[PDB]
């Protein structure tokens, strides 16, 4: 409608997160986005809590719909009836859709607007999900030209972080988690992304005694996150010390 | 595209299923505009779906109304918290208008009737809560009216133990207690209520013990809550 002030973008954007209404608060930050001007750090987290509450909500009713569809299409003497796969595809489209938005403002605005490492890392990291995202719902053709943008974002996110932050920033650390998870679940590589959380965990590890308290315990919260992906993944019990 | 009344029904049990609310609830304003009767189980999905739509936007105006009244500078509060005010009344206005225009009929069995008759007093009831001045006083009328009319009939057709005259009654204390003003008649109906359905909860199979507990446990809540109030075992 009429020029909203950013600022005002960005309150907004923080009532409608303690409101619980994401849609508004992701149109909130898009609005905020299309203003033209970085994000800080606590505005780059808003536009992603934004986005990851739509999208999750978007995936889990899509996951509920695709095993609905196909255990009545297996079972049974029939197939399932063509509500099921209409509706699964109003929610993929709808799905689609939002990453599609999220992959035009980083593409736009963000990834080439950042200043800092740490931000243009979170931002190709924000890519690699996003079309990771995507690789989930998609099928033929466009599945593979989808699974190798995740990967080349995330691969551009995995350089600069080596090249500028430590082993235990939380940034890199989640990038490495997520680019793992892309490697075991979508590229079917699970050799890949068992090394790549092997030695996120292990480098990261090497360092946590230099961490200020603070910094710490979002770097271990990050690494526990990894060492249980590690362990579905790939022994003996532990008594004190 | 299948959309005709019976894949309107399919893909609202499937919306209900993936917690896809919005949808469930278009998918239900839609089969009830077929003009069809609703059966039990479709006239739960039309109310399981409003009520968790309607319910998301009552929580964020509750949060937005808090917020604005700690705050009492800053605009935004205040025009934030009209947008969720304005669409959340935009959907107790569609529910209204779907129980007025298709499913409030003189000549139903008396669950049906009593059952969309406490949802008209219900969606008043949310009007009510953000409404102000001449308007809430005629929204709260409405209210009582609706309120009213299905405690009638659910008295006369009813056994105290029903689950639908449980949540009427229910509905309807927290309406006296709330919005208009009057906890002594909260009270005494949520009293009346609780006494004559305990008296014959041992005739009841174990589902409907289970439905109708449940309910009487609410009513009793509230008469904590509304009352004041150790044991040890026996």
Same mark, same amino acid.
């Given at each position: 409608?009429?020029? #909203? ?17 994401? %849609?508004? #608060? ?7 986005? %299309? ?19 739509? &999208? ?7 996951? &509920?719909?695709?095993? *609905? ?5 297996? +079972? ?14 109003? &929610?993929? =489209? ?8 999220? @992959?035009?403002? $980083?593409?736009?605005?963000? *990834?080439? +607007? ?10 190709? !990291? ?9 690789? %989930? ?6 599945? !593979? ?12 996110? #995995? ?34 992304? *068992? ?9 990261? #590890?090497?360092? @946590?005694? =230099? ?18 992906? @590690? =362990? @579905?993944? =790939? ?5 004190? $010390?």
């Amino acid at each position: 409608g009429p020029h #909203m002030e950013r600022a005002s973008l960005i309150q907004k954007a923080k009532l409608a997160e303690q409101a619980e209404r994401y %849609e508004d #608060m992701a149109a909130f930050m898009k609005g905020a986005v %299309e203003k033209g001007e970085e994000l800080s750090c606590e505005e780059r987290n808003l536009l992603s809590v934004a986005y990851k509450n739509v &999208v999750g909500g978007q995936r889990a009713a899509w996951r &509920v719909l695709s095993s *609905i569809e196909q255990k009545s299409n297996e +079972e049974g003497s029939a197939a399932a009836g063509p509500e099921v796969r209409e509706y699964r595809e109003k &929610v993929e =489209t709808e799905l689609q859709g939002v990453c599609d938005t999220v @992959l035009g403002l $980083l593409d736009s605005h963000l *990834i080439k +607007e950042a200043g800092d490492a740490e931000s243009r890392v979170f931002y190709l !990291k924000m890519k690699g999900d996003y079309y990771r995202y995507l690789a %989930e719902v998609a099928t033929g053709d466009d599945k !593979k030209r989808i699974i190798d943008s995740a990967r080349s974002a995330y691969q551009e996110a #995995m350089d600069i972080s080596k090249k500028e932050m430590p082993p235990t920033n939380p940034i890199r650390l989640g990038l490495a988690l997520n680019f793992s998870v892309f490697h075991y679940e979508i590229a079917n590589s699970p050799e890949e992304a *068992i090394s790549l959380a092997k030695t996120t965990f292990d480098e990261a #590890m090497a360092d @946590l005694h =230099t961490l200020s308290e603070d910094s710490y315990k979002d770097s271990t919260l990050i690494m526990q996150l990894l060492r249980d992906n @590690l =362990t @579905l993944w =790939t022994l003996r019990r532990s008594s004190l $010390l």
